[PDB]
Amino acid sequence: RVQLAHHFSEPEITLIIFGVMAGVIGTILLISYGIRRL
Amino acid sequence: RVQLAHHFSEPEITLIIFGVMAGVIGTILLISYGIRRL
Numbered sequence: 001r002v003q004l005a006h007h008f009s010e011p012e013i014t015l016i017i018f019g020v021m022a023g024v025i026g027t028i029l030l031i032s033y034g035i036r037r038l
Numbered sequence: 039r040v041q042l043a044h045h046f047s048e049p050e051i052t053l054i055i056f057g058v059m060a061g062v063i064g065t066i067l068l069i070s071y072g073i074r075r076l
Contacts, residue, residue: 012053019057020064027065
């Protein structure tokens with residue numbers, strides 16, 4: 001798993017973060033709801 | 039430059055899905071650990 005070519009790439013950085021951010025937060029909310037049962 | 043050499047591209051959707059997928063699953067695992075308290 002070694003990289004090559006000294007330079008920046010994958011400009012979709014923000015996208016990756018946003019996705020994980022939305023998913024993580026989403027699961028938390030849903031999960032928190034299960035514990036309550038209501 | 040033609041054929042082979044991993045034809046470049048410009049994805050997006052996949053990235054968004056992967057991110058949310060990793061984040062969601064990640065939170066679940068961590069959360070599940072808290073409920074166990076061990």
